[PDB]
Amino acid sequence: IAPNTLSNSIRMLGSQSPLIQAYGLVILQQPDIKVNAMSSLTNHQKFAKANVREWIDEYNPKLIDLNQEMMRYSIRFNSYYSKLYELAGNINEDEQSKADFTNAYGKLQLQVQSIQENMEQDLLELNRFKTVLDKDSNNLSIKADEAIKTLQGSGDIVKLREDIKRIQGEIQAELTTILNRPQEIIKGSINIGKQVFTITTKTIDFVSIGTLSNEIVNAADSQTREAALRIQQKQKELLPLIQKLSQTEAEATQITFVEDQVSSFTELIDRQITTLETLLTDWKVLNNNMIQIQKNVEEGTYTDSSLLQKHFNQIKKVSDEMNKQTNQFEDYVTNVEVH
Numbered sequence: 001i002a003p004n005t006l007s008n009s010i011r012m013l014g015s016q017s018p019l020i021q022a023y024g025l026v027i028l029q030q031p032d033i034k035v036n037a038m039s040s041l042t043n044h045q046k047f048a049k050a051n052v053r054e055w056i057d058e059y060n061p062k063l064i065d066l067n068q069e070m071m072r073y074s075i076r077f078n079s080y081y082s083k084l085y086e087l088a089g090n091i092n093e094d095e096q097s098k099a100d101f102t103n104a105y106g107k108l109q110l111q112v113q114s115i116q117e118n119m120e121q122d123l124l125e126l127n128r129f130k131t132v133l134d135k136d137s138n139n140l141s142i143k144a145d146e147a148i149k150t151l152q153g154s155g156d157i158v159k160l161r162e163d164i165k166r167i168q169g170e171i172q173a174e175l176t177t178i179l180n181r182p183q184e185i186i187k188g189s190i191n192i193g194k195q196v197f198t199i200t201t202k203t204i205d206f207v208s209i210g211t212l213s214n215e216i217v218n219a220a221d222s223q224t225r226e227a228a229l230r231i232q233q234k235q236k237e238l239l240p241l242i243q244k245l246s247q248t249e250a251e252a253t254q255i256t257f258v259e260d261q262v263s264s265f266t267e268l269i270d271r272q273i274t275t276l277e278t279l280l281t282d283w284k285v286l287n288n289n290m291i292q293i294q295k296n297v298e299e300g301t302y303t304d305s306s307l308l309q310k311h312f313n314q315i316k317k318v319s320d321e322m323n324k325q326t327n328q329f330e331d332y333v334t335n336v337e338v339h
Contacts, residue, residue, distance in 0.1 A: 001289045003317035009279035010070065010322065013063060014329030015179045016272045018336040020060075022190045022209055023172075023265040024052040025338060029192060030207040030261060037251045038147035041258060044140040048262045051133050055269065059129055062122045063276070064333065069115050071326035077108060077319045085316075088308045091297065102297055109290045116287055119280045123273070130273050137266040144259040151249045160245040161256050167234050167241070168260050171209065172267075174227045174234075178216060179336075181224050186331035189213035190338050195239075199247045206242060206257060208235075286318060 027048050035041045087101040152158060175190075193210025196203050217228045246253040293311055302308040 001286070001311065001314040001318065003314070003321060005286050005289075005318050006279065006282050006322060006325070008325070009275050009282065010067070010325035011328045011332075012180075013067070013272060013275050013279070014325075014332035016268065016275065017060070017063070017329075017333045018190060018338055019172075019175055019179055020055070020265065020268045020272060021338045022192060023261070023268055024055065025192050026207050026209065027052050027261050027265055029194070030257060031205050033254055033258070035147075035251045035254050037151050038143060038255055040143050041147070041255060044136070044143065044262075045258050047136050048140070048258070048265075051129075051136060052265065054129065059126055062126070063272075066115070066119060066122060067326050067329045069118065070322055071330070073111055073115060074319045074323040074326065076111070077316075078323065080104065080108070081316055081319075085309060085312055088312045089305050091302060091305050091308060093305075098297070102294070105297075106294065109287070109294060112283075112287045112290055116280070116283055119276070119283060123276055123280060126273050126276065130270060133266055133269060137262050140259055140262055144255050147255055148252055151252050153249070157245065157249055157252050160241055160248070161252065164238060164241050164245065164256060165260055167238055168208075168264065171231055171234050172264055174231050175209065177227050178212075178224055179332075181221055186328065187335045188215040189336070192339065197243055197246050197253075199243075199250055202250060204242075204246050204250060204253055207261075210235075290315065 030045075033041065033045060084101065084104055087097050087104070090097040091101055092098070148157065148161060189212070190209060191211045191213075193208060195206045195208070197206065198204075212228055212231070216224060217232075219225045219228070242253060245256070293308070293315075296302060297308065
């Protein structure tokens, strides 16, 4: 049993969370729109908003609950460690101690079992949502492409559209890189902004991730700061591209935003669900390993109790790291705020 059994999935589920909350609020806040060139657009947008709220109301808090469960397990385990380490060393010294260790260790394995089963249920329910969302986004992307091709007159609008999407993707990735870096103290803020463009008339709304907090923009960590500066620049690059597209065909802009916003959020949801699957795959390895220790104690394999103490310590190292990462998770979803 490696101290690294559970990799970095617990932490990453936390650090992924503020970006998902931001890209979600962008969808909620982009205004309800009708476009004659794509009459399905209104309904696709309806679905997108309802999906985001489903994630807020129903799904995201499963992840929060899981995390609390793994934290409380690690607290419990750590609280019993010294006495159970001592029992482990005495399993052959007296048949009653062997009883007492197998009883308590067994309860802790049951608790680990119980978290595994909650995880498994969570993931079944989360993949039902992922199925709907992934389909919704792809339907919308397909009808967007089709409406745009009807707008495009006599290569202009496609090129602009692509460049706007390219830059939005580069922003998304830089933001991810920021949230992936080691923060000693986990703190900051992502604000969502609204911009308006004027054509002839009429006005065009553009909601997006706007300003990042002082903690990020002036981070001591040069990779974080530099990534924050690049975001600032790319945000400004969007602005002539959007005016050009909008003045050429305004509905192409309004379609472009909705489809790009939903696709971002969808990508981030997918990645977070994948991260949970990896956590489950690894948690199963831990639990199995724990069950084998159990079986070998009962079958009498530990004729040398110090080898059981060595294995019990290995599990302590995993407990400690679980406590570390669940606390990080909690910090990310508490202290990196989104408005």
